[PDB]
Amino acid sequence: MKYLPQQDPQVFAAIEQERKRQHAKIELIASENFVSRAVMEAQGSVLTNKFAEGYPGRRYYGGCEYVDIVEELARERAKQLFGAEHANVQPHSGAQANMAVYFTVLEHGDTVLGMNLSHGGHLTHGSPVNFSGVQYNFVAYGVDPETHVIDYDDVREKARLHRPKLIVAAASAYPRIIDFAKFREIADEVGAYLMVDMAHIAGLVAAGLHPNPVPYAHFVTTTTHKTLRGPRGGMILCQEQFAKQIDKAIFPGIQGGPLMHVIAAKAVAFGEALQDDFKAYAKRVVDNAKRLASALQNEGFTLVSGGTDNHLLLVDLRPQQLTGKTAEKVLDEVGITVNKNTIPYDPESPFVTSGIRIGTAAVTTRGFGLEEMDEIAAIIGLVLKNVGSEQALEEARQRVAALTD
Amino acid sequence: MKYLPQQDPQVFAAIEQERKRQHAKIELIASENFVSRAVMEAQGSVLTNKFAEGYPGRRYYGGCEYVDIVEELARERAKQLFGAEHANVQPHSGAQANMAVYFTVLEHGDTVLGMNLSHGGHLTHGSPVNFSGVQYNFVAYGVDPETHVIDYDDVREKARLHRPKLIVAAASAYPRIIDFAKFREIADEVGAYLMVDMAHIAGLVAAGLHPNPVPYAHFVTTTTHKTLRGPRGGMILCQEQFAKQIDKAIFPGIQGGPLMHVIAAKAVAFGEALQDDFKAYAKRVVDNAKRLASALQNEGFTLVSGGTDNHLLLVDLRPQQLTGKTAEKVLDEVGITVNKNTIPYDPESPFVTSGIRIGTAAVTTRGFGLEEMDEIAAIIGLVLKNVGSEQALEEARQRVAALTD
């Protein structure tokens, strides 16, 4: 940086702390990643100066000839990556992408069926303190209490009883592959639309490592920043038949001017994801998660669903008589970043929890491999088995530092 | 840029076109501006990598120690700039800021009173194709048909007849000072909340050049990118009594993770606005708009309300028998960027219009002064009086190029 250090010492000092923090810590928050320098440069571009309400070639303001090219690059690359007929790359966030889909097909008070929030569903899939649960009548399907896999008969029964207008599939904390074909079969049986929120797994989908919801879902929403490794923002994919309605839902429906610099950054990230090396990266993410899961089991931890098919895993801490809150706190003390997370049928509140969620996308981006997974698991074992030993915690701290260099 | 040119030639070429376009054209879109290099650097920072759901010291995810400092710098600087008791700097956009305020105080179907969209009100102030007009029952007050100033007796009558729960003041295309004290008096009479959307005039407010709505309004919303000259995004100001509710409306109500890099950029812009030179800048904006208005009148143009008190003006093209659409198109041909805009009581649709809106914030940032205003007015006269003369248009083109160098 050249100008910020002189103009704003306070903001610069804080940014520099954060940059150094990102290097020093072992980032295991499953939604986190590190974007490329190219993505950052796009975000830091003069495109922030352009008002571009509307869509490419159909803007409400002049001078958009070049931001149109950028937005179309994002849309066409997204379509290539996911085999979708239409992309809307304007959503400011995953929340706004979901909000727009709801606005498109639902009226206030309509019934929607989503994944139980305490079994892995997202806030925007029906929390009663979120617009989703306040605006629409959400009902929930669950995972099996033993296997922790989505109970498709429960999805079906809930669908048939409640007659939702919309079914939502996808999750913030579900470690197994989701069967989109079964979701669409159930949607078809009850005459509901199917929306898949693939935010967590979008990079894995792009890489052919998780089944693609696009052929099965009427609408697919996603963030651009988790396993997709792009800038923070949202996107909607759909078939050409819904394109006009979806686009109108985003503008003039729920947003105004798009963030053209972020859309440039989206184009860049999609460009990266189209490359062979991104596919290799995504495979390492999944391989690393499997290895980490196995190594954690070797340390004596129980995992929700008994492992993982994707980038993330959940540790059920009940055997260790620990809460997720306690585990999160002590891991923070040694430089490992996780989050407390409800496990299915959790006896604790979502503010305490019986689990921690762990993901490998960020450490994989840093170049961590199988050996590092073994060592991360060993450090987690050392820490969680010795929460009262400052010597153990100091050893852990030193081992974390050895990993991050 | 270092990495983007190598990684993504297509995106880079388009960005470079846009950068050169920004230099070459005379940008008169009233909502447009040019941010500092420091603001851009903040947006292009590693803060895009941080998930930070929640608020400073009350986050739902670990590792936020430094992004907390950034967010608090934005909040404290905003409070200093506007004398507000509370700031929420998380809104992704002006639309989301407004959406959050509505979510805080209204239920689905509640009546809201806003400025007539065809007299200067914004899309999010009740358009029937926007969530505002779909979710809530909007009624409108108008400007006087002769003076084009808000008719405060009409505000009062509409308030008393319709009994809105919320009154909205502020505008996308209103060239005169808004009387917030009268709005609050009317709100008080009918027991309504008052929300002021100061997006257009926020920089002028910060500089003491427009009355501050903060003392009068229960909620003040704004964008950070118009006359405030910051990154693209939203903000809400309110008294401490509504702080908790407003914050909950943004998260978990309507958004999820905030854009921490954009929030850094907000802090930077607020830092700039606190400086003496920003006050001098804002005065030049208003002086330039007055001079441009006067010079346009000298060319024989009629202005809505007969002039301006702020950064923007509206030309009523009816005397010239031109539509806003025709004027916008031909000005685009010579390198002047304006937008067609409905004028009060416009006989034309909002897609054709009888006006063009013009603002001086962007050209002022480029260092244009009174002499440049005279020349811009003269070029506009040359063009609009000779729409069928390619020679006139070429002369205009050359004069535009002389201004932008």
mmCIF file of C-alpha atoms in Angstrom, chain A residues 61-383:
data_model
loop_
_atom_site.group_PDB
_atom_site.id
_atom_site.type_symbol
_atom_site.label_atom_id
_atom_site.label_comp_id
_atom_site.label_asym_id
_atom_site.label_seq_id
_atom_site.Cartn_x
_atom_site.Cartn_y
_atom_site.Cartn_z
ATOM 1 C CA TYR A 61 -27.421 5.292 -16.373
ATOM 2 C CA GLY A 62 -24.972 6.113 -19.170
ATOM 3 C CA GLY A 63 -21.251 5.388 -19.369
ATOM 4 C CA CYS A 64 -21.545 1.679 -18.491
ATOM 5 C CA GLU A 65 -19.941 0.335 -21.696
ATOM 6 C CA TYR A 66 -16.925 -1.079 -19.833
ATOM 7 C CA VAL A 67 -18.493 -2.173 -16.538
ATOM 8 C CA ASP A 68 -20.948 -4.063 -18.823
ATOM 9 C CA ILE A 69 -18.018 -6.042 -20.204
ATOM 10 C CA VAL A 70 -16.906 -6.830 -16.637
ATOM 11 C CA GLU A 71 -20.377 -7.918 -15.494
ATOM 12 C CA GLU A 72 -20.831 -10.097 -18.592
ATOM 13 C CA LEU A 73 -17.429 -11.746 -18.010
ATOM 14 C CA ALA A 74 -18.622 -12.605 -14.483
ATOM 15 C CA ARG A 75 -21.976 -13.958 -15.795
ATOM 16 C CA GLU A 76 -20.521 -15.992 -18.682
ATOM 17 C CA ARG A 77 -17.724 -17.464 -16.535
ATOM 18 C CA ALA A 78 -20.258 -18.383 -13.826
ATOM 19 C CA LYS A 79 -22.420 -20.112 -16.457
ATOM 20 C CA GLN A 80 -19.414 -22.027 -17.791
ATOM 21 C CA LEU A 81 -18.307 -23.036 -14.267
ATOM 22 C CA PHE A 82 -21.724 -24.311 -13.150
ATOM 23 C CA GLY A 83 -23.431 -25.134 -16.451
ATOM 24 C CA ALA A 84 -26.262 -22.736 -15.579
ATOM 25 C CA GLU A 85 -28.463 -21.035 -18.171
ATOM 26 C CA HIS A 86 -28.504 -17.700 -16.316
ATOM 27 C CA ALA A 87 -26.368 -15.967 -13.671
ATOM 28 C CA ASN A 88 -27.090 -12.897 -11.597
ATOM 29 C CA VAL A 89 -23.784 -11.673 -10.134
ATOM 30 C CA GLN A 90 -25.166 -8.540 -8.444
ATOM 31 C CA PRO A 91 -26.246 -9.866 -5.013
ATOM 32 C CA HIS A 92 -24.298 -7.982 -2.284
ATOM 33 C CA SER A 93 -24.192 -11.114 -0.128
ATOM 34 C CA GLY A 94 -25.486 -14.704 0.240
ATOM 35 C CA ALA A 95 -28.276 -13.226 2.424
ATOM 36 C CA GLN A 96 -29.323 -10.901 -0.431
ATOM 37 C CA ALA A 97 -29.159 -13.729 -2.990
ATOM 38 C CA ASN A 98 -31.509 -15.812 -0.803
ATOM 39 C CA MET A 99 -33.713 -12.784 -0.079
ATOM 40 C CA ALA A 100 -34.104 -12.179 -3.843
ATOM 41 C CA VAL A 101 -35.108 -15.779 -4.564
ATOM 42 C CA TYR A 102 -37.698 -15.644 -1.761
ATOM 43 C CA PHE A 103 -38.977 -12.295 -3.140
ATOM 44 C CA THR A 104 -39.313 -13.916 -6.606
ATOM 45 C CA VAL A 105 -41.519 -16.894 -5.764
ATOM 46 C CA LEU A 106 -43.070 -16.261 -2.346
ATOM 47 C CA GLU A 107 -45.671 -13.960 -0.862
ATOM 48 C CA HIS A 108 -45.532 -12.823 2.750
ATOM 49 C CA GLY A 109 -46.581 -15.747 4.987
ATOM 50 C CA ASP A 110 -46.000 -18.536 2.451
ATOM 51 C CA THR A 111 -44.734 -21.826 3.860
ATOM 52 C CA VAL A 112 -41.097 -22.815 3.147
ATOM 53 C CA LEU A 113 -39.351 -26.024 4.149
ATOM 54 C CA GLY A 114 -35.659 -25.727 5.081
ATOM 55 C CA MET A 115 -32.979 -27.684 6.954
ATOM 56 C CA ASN A 116 -33.284 -27.561 10.748
ATOM 57 C CA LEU A 117 -30.998 -24.685 11.852
ATOM 58 C CA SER A 118 -29.623 -26.785 14.706
ATOM 59 C CA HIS A 119 -28.818 -29.679 12.317
ATOM 60 C CA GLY A 120 -26.878 -27.501 9.846
ATOM 61 C CA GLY A 121 -29.311 -25.072 8.172
ATOM 62 C CA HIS A 122 -28.404 -21.379 7.732
ATOM 63 C CA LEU A 123 -29.844 -18.299 9.488
ATOM 64 C CA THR A 124 -31.480 -17.196 6.187
ATOM 65 C CA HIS A 125 -33.193 -20.613 5.911
ATOM 66 C CA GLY A 126 -35.820 -19.646 8.485
ATOM 67 C CA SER A 127 -34.408 -18.256 11.755
ATOM 68 C CA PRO A 128 -37.216 -16.479 13.685
ATOM 69 C CA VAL A 129 -34.864 -13.496 14.261
ATOM 70 C CA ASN A 130 -33.974 -13.338 10.536
ATOM 71 C CA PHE A 131 -36.152 -11.783 7.818
ATOM 72 C CA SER A 132 -36.664 -15.352 6.438
ATOM 73 C CA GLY A 133 -38.435 -16.691 9.535
ATOM 74 C CA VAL A 134 -40.274 -13.397 10.130
ATOM 75 C CA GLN A 135 -41.513 -12.906 6.543
ATOM 76 C CA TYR A 136 -42.295 -16.514 5.694
ATOM 77 C CA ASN A 137 -43.646 -19.507 7.530
ATOM 78 C CA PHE A 138 -40.634 -21.833 7.862
ATOM 79 C CA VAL A 139 -40.864 -25.519 8.740
ATOM 80 C CA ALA A 140 -37.813 -27.786 9.072
ATOM 81 C CA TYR A 141 -36.545 -31.255 8.153
ATOM 82 C CA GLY A 142 -33.898 -33.054 10.215
ATOM 83 C CA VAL A 143 -30.978 -35.442 10.027
ATOM 84 C CA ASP A 144 -31.132 -38.997 11.387
ATOM 85 C CA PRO A 145 -30.221 -39.022 15.150
ATOM 86 C CA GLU A 146 -27.654 -41.807 14.670
ATOM 87 C CA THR A 147 -26.098 -41.314 11.227
ATOM 88 C CA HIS A 148 -26.541 -37.478 11.150
ATOM 89 C CA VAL A 149 -27.387 -37.756 7.426
ATOM 90 C CA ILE A 150 -30.441 -35.818 6.139
ATOM 91 C CA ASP A 151 -33.510 -38.000 6.623
ATOM 92 C CA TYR A 152 -35.103 -37.860 3.154
ATOM 93 C CA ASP A 153 -38.282 -39.502 4.453
ATOM 94 C CA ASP A 154 -38.535 -36.628 6.951
ATOM 95 C CA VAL A 155 -37.989 -34.110 4.108
ATOM 96 C CA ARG A 156 -40.850 -35.854 2.256
ATOM 97 C CA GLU A 157 -43.211 -36.092 5.247
ATOM 98 C CA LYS A 158 -42.689 -32.407 6.164
ATOM 99 C CA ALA A 159 -43.243 -31.446 2.514
ATOM 100 C CA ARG A 160 -46.469 -33.484 2.294
ATOM 101 C CA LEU A 161 -47.866 -32.307 5.644
ATOM 102 C CA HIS A 162 -47.010 -28.591 5.358
ATOM 103 C CA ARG A 163 -47.309 -28.148 1.556
ATOM 104 C CA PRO A 164 -44.501 -25.583 1.249
ATOM 105 C CA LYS A 165 -44.364 -23.348 -1.826
ATOM 106 C CA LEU A 166 -40.546 -23.626 -1.721
ATOM 107 C CA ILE A 167 -38.102 -26.241 -0.395
ATOM 108 C CA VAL A 168 -34.553 -25.116 0.506
ATOM 109 C CA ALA A 169 -31.636 -27.564 0.435
ATOM 110 C CA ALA A 170 -28.056 -26.820 1.576
ATOM 111 C CA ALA A 171 -26.338 -26.000 4.788
ATOM 112 C CA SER A 172 -23.771 -24.072 6.803
ATOM 113 C CA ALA A 173 -22.636 -27.139 8.781
ATOM 114 C CA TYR A 174 -23.441 -30.393 6.980
ATOM 115 C CA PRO A 175 -20.380 -32.655 6.361
ATOM 116 C CA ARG A 176 -21.942 -35.043 3.825
ATOM 117 C CA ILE A 177 -23.007 -34.898 0.179
ATOM 118 C CA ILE A 178 -26.572 -33.599 -0.301
ATOM 119 C CA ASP A 179 -28.794 -35.597 -2.641
ATOM 120 C CA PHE A 180 -30.326 -32.903 -4.885
ATOM 121 C CA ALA A 181 -32.162 -35.447 -7.036
ATOM 122 C CA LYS A 182 -34.140 -36.630 -4.010
ATOM 123 C CA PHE A 183 -34.888 -33.016 -3.052
ATOM 124 C CA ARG A 184 -36.228 -32.336 -6.553
ATOM 125 C CA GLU A 185 -38.293 -35.574 -6.508
ATOM 126 C CA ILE A 186 -39.898 -34.449 -3.239
ATOM 127 C CA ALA A 187 -40.439 -30.878 -4.541
ATOM 128 C CA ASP A 188 -42.078 -32.340 -7.664
ATOM 129 C CA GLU A 189 -44.372 -34.533 -5.538
ATOM 130 C CA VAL A 190 -45.768 -31.549 -3.607
ATOM 131 C CA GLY A 191 -45.581 -28.951 -6.442
ATOM 132 C CA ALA A 192 -42.898 -26.863 -4.682
ATOM 133 C CA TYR A 193 -39.980 -24.931 -6.167
ATOM 134 C CA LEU A 194 -36.536 -26.185 -5.129
ATOM 135 C CA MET A 195 -33.840 -23.675 -4.102
ATOM 136 C CA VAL A 196 -30.334 -24.932 -3.316
ATOM 137 C CA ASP A 197 -28.063 -22.683 -1.264
ATOM 138 C CA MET A 198 -24.644 -24.067 -2.236
ATOM 139 C CA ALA A 199 -22.599 -21.313 -0.521
ATOM 140 C CA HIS A 200 -20.331 -23.697 1.422
ATOM 141 C CA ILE A 201 -19.720 -26.199 -1.360
ATOM 142 C CA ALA A 202 -19.693 -23.966 -4.457
ATOM 143 C CA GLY A 203 -15.915 -24.441 -5.069
ATOM 144 C CA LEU A 204 -16.302 -28.204 -4.692
ATOM 145 C CA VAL A 205 -19.212 -28.187 -7.183
ATOM 146 C CA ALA A 206 -17.105 -26.127 -9.646
ATOM 147 C CA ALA A 207 -14.339 -28.735 -9.296
ATOM 148 C CA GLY A 208 -16.661 -31.756 -9.824
ATOM 149 C CA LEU A 209 -16.168 -32.950 -6.246
ATOM 150 C CA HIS A 210 -19.785 -32.498 -5.092
ATOM 151 C CA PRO A 211 -22.861 -33.182 -7.239
ATOM 152 C CA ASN A 212 -24.045 -30.060 -9.044
ATOM 153 C CA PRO A 213 -27.489 -28.760 -7.875
ATOM 154 C CA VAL A 214 -27.982 -26.699 -11.063
ATOM 155 C CA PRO A 215 -29.697 -29.497 -13.107
ATOM 156 C CA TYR A 216 -32.062 -30.215 -10.165
ATOM 157 C CA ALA A 217 -32.896 -26.854 -8.652
ATOM 158 C CA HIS A 218 -35.115 -24.082 -10.004
ATOM 159 C CA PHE A 219 -32.810 -21.627 -8.213
ATOM 160 C CA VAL A 220 -29.301 -22.010 -6.898
ATOM 161 C CA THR A 221 -27.877 -19.376 -4.570
ATOM 162 C CA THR A 222 -24.315 -19.077 -3.353
ATOM 163 C CA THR A 223 -21.723 -16.847 -1.801
ATOM 164 C CA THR A 224 -18.629 -16.151 -3.896
ATOM 165 C CA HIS A 225 -16.145 -16.351 -0.885
ATOM 166 C CA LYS A 226 -16.106 -19.772 0.805
ATOM 167 C CA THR A 227 -14.778 -22.826 -1.080
ATOM 168 C CA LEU A 228 -15.157 -20.767 -4.326
ATOM 169 C CA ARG A 229 -12.319 -18.583 -2.944
ATOM 170 C CA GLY A 230 -13.642 -15.305 -4.334
ATOM 171 C CA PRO A 231 -14.524 -11.850 -2.951
ATOM 172 C CA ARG A 232 -17.295 -11.509 -0.363
ATOM 173 C CA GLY A 233 -20.657 -11.424 -2.166
ATOM 174 C CA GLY A 234 -23.600 -13.387 -3.551
ATOM 175 C CA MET A 235 -24.827 -14.922 -6.819
ATOM 176 C CA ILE A 236 -27.954 -16.581 -8.173
ATOM 177 C CA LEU A 237 -28.037 -19.251 -10.901
ATOM 178 C CA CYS A 238 -31.246 -20.361 -12.669
ATOM 179 C CA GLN A 239 -32.697 -21.584 -15.959
ATOM 180 C CA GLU A 240 -33.501 -19.046 -18.662
ATOM 181 C CA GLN A 241 -37.238 -19.307 -17.796
ATOM 182 C CA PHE A 242 -36.724 -17.535 -14.421
ATOM 183 C CA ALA A 243 -33.974 -15.113 -15.552
ATOM 184 C CA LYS A 244 -36.159 -12.047 -16.034
ATOM 185 C CA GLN A 245 -37.985 -12.534 -12.718
ATOM 186 C CA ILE A 246 -34.742 -13.183 -10.769
ATOM 187 C CA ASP A 247 -33.059 -10.137 -12.296
ATOM 188 C CA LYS A 248 -36.071 -7.953 -11.434
ATOM 189 C CA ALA A 249 -36.031 -9.363 -7.859
ATOM 190 C CA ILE A 250 -32.448 -8.109 -7.418
ATOM 191 C CA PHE A 251 -33.176 -4.792 -9.141
ATOM 192 C CA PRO A 252 -35.524 -2.957 -8.714
ATOM 193 C CA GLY A 253 -36.746 -5.504 -6.127
ATOM 194 C CA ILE A 254 -34.263 -5.732 -3.265
ATOM 195 C CA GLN A 255 -31.091 -3.778 -4.211
ATOM 196 C CA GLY A 256 -30.073 -0.642 -6.160
ATOM 197 C CA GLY A 257 -26.638 0.025 -7.625
ATOM 198 C CA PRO A 258 -24.400 -3.086 -7.803
ATOM 199 C CA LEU A 259 -20.815 -3.143 -6.459
ATOM 200 C CA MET A 260 -19.014 -3.122 -9.837
ATOM 201 C CA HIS A 261 -15.500 -3.508 -8.312
ATOM 202 C CA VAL A 262 -16.696 -6.573 -6.354
ATOM 203 C CA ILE A 263 -18.292 -7.911 -9.564
ATOM 204 C CA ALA A 264 -14.892 -7.450 -11.287
ATOM 205 C CA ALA A 265 -13.405 -9.457 -8.374
ATOM 206 C CA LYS A 266 -16.107 -12.119 -8.902
ATOM 207 C CA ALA A 267 -15.068 -12.367 -12.600
ATOM 208 C CA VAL A 268 -11.457 -12.824 -11.500
ATOM 209 C CA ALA A 269 -12.324 -15.575 -8.998
ATOM 210 C CA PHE A 270 -14.491 -17.399 -11.562
ATOM 211 C CA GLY A 271 -11.543 -17.155 -14.028
ATOM 212 C CA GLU A 272 -9.326 -18.768 -11.397
ATOM 213 C CA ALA A 273 -11.883 -21.526 -10.685
ATOM 214 C CA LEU A 274 -12.040 -22.404 -14.405
ATOM 215 C CA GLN A 275 -8.323 -23.278 -14.309
ATOM 216 C CA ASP A 276 -6.951 -26.800 -13.822
ATOM 217 C CA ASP A 277 -5.005 -25.780 -10.741
ATOM 218 C CA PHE A 278 -8.226 -24.765 -8.971
ATOM 219 C CA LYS A 279 -9.544 -28.307 -9.501
ATOM 220 C CA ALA A 280 -6.337 -29.687 -7.953
ATOM 221 C CA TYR A 281 -6.746 -27.229 -5.045
ATOM 222 C CA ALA A 282 -10.353 -28.305 -4.425
ATOM 223 C CA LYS A 283 -9.335 -31.996 -4.405
ATOM 224 C CA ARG A 284 -6.680 -31.200 -1.796
ATOM 225 C CA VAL A 285 -9.365 -29.431 0.263
ATOM 226 C CA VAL A 286 -11.490 -32.594 0.327
ATOM 227 C CA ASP A 287 -8.483 -34.939 0.768
ATOM 228 C CA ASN A 288 -7.259 -32.738 3.650
ATOM 229 C CA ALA A 289 -10.690 -32.749 5.317
ATOM 230 C CA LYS A 290 -10.859 -36.582 5.078
ATOM 231 C CA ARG A 291 -7.327 -36.871 6.468
ATOM 232 C CA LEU A 292 -8.046 -34.366 9.253
ATOM 233 C CA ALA A 293 -11.280 -36.238 10.121
ATOM 234 C CA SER A 294 -9.397 -39.582 10.251
ATOM 235 C CA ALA A 295 -6.559 -38.077 12.316
ATOM 236 C CA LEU A 296 -9.054 -36.523 14.772
ATOM 237 C CA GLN A 297 -10.721 -39.956 15.149
ATOM 238 C CA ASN A 298 -7.235 -41.401 15.776
ATOM 239 C CA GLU A 299 -6.925 -38.881 18.660
ATOM 240 C CA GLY A 300 -10.200 -40.264 20.061
ATOM 241 C CA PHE A 301 -12.673 -37.617 18.885
ATOM 242 C CA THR A 302 -16.205 -38.429 17.743
ATOM 243 C CA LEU A 303 -17.282 -36.733 14.488
ATOM 244 C CA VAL A 304 -20.855 -35.853 13.523
ATOM 245 C CA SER A 305 -21.945 -38.353 10.785
ATOM 246 C CA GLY A 306 -18.686 -40.298 11.427
ATOM 247 C CA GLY A 307 -16.574 -38.267 8.975
ATOM 248 C CA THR A 308 -16.905 -35.995 5.962
ATOM 249 C CA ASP A 309 -17.577 -35.979 2.206
ATOM 250 C CA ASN A 310 -16.599 -32.312 1.766
ATOM 251 C CA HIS A 311 -14.440 -29.463 3.169
ATOM 252 C CA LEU A 312 -15.839 -29.529 6.688
ATOM 253 C CA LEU A 313 -16.279 -31.659 9.770
ATOM 254 C CA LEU A 314 -18.023 -31.309 13.135
ATOM 255 C CA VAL A 315 -16.519 -32.667 16.372
ATOM 256 C CA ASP A 316 -19.113 -33.887 18.914
ATOM 257 C CA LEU A 317 -17.350 -32.977 22.176
ATOM 258 C CA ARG A 318 -19.807 -34.799 24.502
ATOM 259 C CA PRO A 319 -17.423 -37.793 25.036
ATOM 260 C CA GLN A 320 -14.805 -35.325 26.386
ATOM 261 C CA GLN A 321 -17.463 -33.597 28.560
ATOM 262 C CA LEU A 322 -16.605 -30.284 26.828
ATOM 263 C CA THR A 323 -18.857 -27.622 25.318
ATOM 264 C CA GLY A 324 -18.063 -26.062 21.914
ATOM 265 C CA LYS A 325 -17.700 -22.715 23.683
ATOM 266 C CA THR A 326 -14.987 -24.072 26.012
ATOM 267 C CA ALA A 327 -13.131 -25.764 23.106
ATOM 268 C CA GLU A 328 -13.312 -22.660 20.888
ATOM 269 C CA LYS A 329 -11.918 -20.469 23.713
ATOM 270 C CA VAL A 330 -8.961 -22.696 24.569
ATOM 271 C CA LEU A 331 -8.055 -23.309 20.907
ATOM 272 C CA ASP A 332 -8.058 -19.508 20.444
ATOM 273 C CA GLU A 333 -5.464 -19.335 23.266
ATOM 274 C CA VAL A 334 -3.011 -21.391 21.173
ATOM 275 C CA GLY A 335 -3.655 -19.769 17.759
ATOM 276 C CA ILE A 336 -6.179 -22.200 16.232
ATOM 277 C CA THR A 337 -9.377 -20.565 14.994
ATOM 278 C CA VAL A 338 -12.501 -22.714 15.028
ATOM 279 C CA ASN A 339 -16.116 -22.026 15.863
ATOM 280 C CA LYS A 340 -18.417 -23.557 18.390
ATOM 281 C CA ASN A 341 -21.273 -25.173 16.493
ATOM 282 C CA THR A 342 -24.508 -26.934 17.408
ATOM 283 C CA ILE A 343 -24.452 -30.650 16.624
ATOM 284 C CA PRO A 344 -27.732 -32.458 15.666
ATOM 285 C CA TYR A 345 -29.951 -32.991 18.783
ATOM 286 C CA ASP A 346 -27.565 -30.827 20.801
ATOM 287 C CA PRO A 347 -28.529 -30.733 24.519
ATOM 288 C CA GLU A 348 -26.896 -27.273 24.749
ATOM 289 C CA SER A 349 -28.044 -23.899 23.496
ATOM 290 C CA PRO A 350 -26.615 -22.515 20.180
ATOM 291 C CA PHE A 351 -24.664 -20.049 22.348
ATOM 292 C CA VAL A 352 -22.816 -22.855 24.208
ATOM 293 C CA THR A 353 -23.135 -25.967 21.946
ATOM 294 C CA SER A 354 -21.614 -29.473 22.138
ATOM 295 C CA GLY A 355 -19.461 -29.185 18.979
ATOM 296 C CA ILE A 356 -16.810 -27.351 17.044
ATOM 297 C CA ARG A 357 -16.909 -26.943 13.278
ATOM 298 C CA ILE A 358 -13.643 -27.238 11.328
ATOM 299 C CA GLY A 359 -12.921 -26.700 7.604
ATOM 300 C CA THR A 360 -9.766 -27.094 5.487
ATOM 301 C CA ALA A 361 -10.308 -24.605 2.603
ATOM 302 C CA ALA A 362 -8.179 -21.825 4.153
ATOM 303 C CA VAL A 363 -5.219 -23.963 5.335
ATOM 304 C CA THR A 364 -5.245 -25.762 1.955
ATOM 305 C CA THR A 365 -4.940 -22.403 0.186
ATOM 306 C CA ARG A 366 -1.860 -21.776 2.367
ATOM 307 C CA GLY A 367 -0.361 -25.008 1.021
ATOM 308 C CA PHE A 368 -1.045 -27.322 4.003
ATOM 309 C CA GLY A 369 -1.268 -31.017 3.112
ATOM 310 C CA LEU A 370 -1.786 -34.444 4.700
ATOM 311 C CA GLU A 371 1.163 -34.209 7.160
ATOM 312 C CA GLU A 372 -0.125 -30.826 8.369
ATOM 313 C CA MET A 373 -3.561 -32.317 8.851
ATOM 314 C CA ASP A 374 -2.056 -35.015 11.116
ATOM 315 C CA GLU A 375 -0.246 -32.334 13.132
ATOM 316 C CA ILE A 376 -3.316 -30.084 13.433
ATOM 317 C CA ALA A 377 -5.279 -33.124 14.744
ATOM 318 C CA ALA A 378 -2.457 -33.923 17.211
ATOM 319 C CA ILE A 379 -2.372 -30.315 18.489
ATOM 320 C CA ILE A 380 -6.166 -30.304 18.905
ATOM 321 C CA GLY A 381 -5.883 -33.585 20.879
ATOM 322 C CA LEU A 382 -3.080 -32.133 23.044
ATOM 323 C CA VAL A 383 -5.140 -29.031 23.795
#
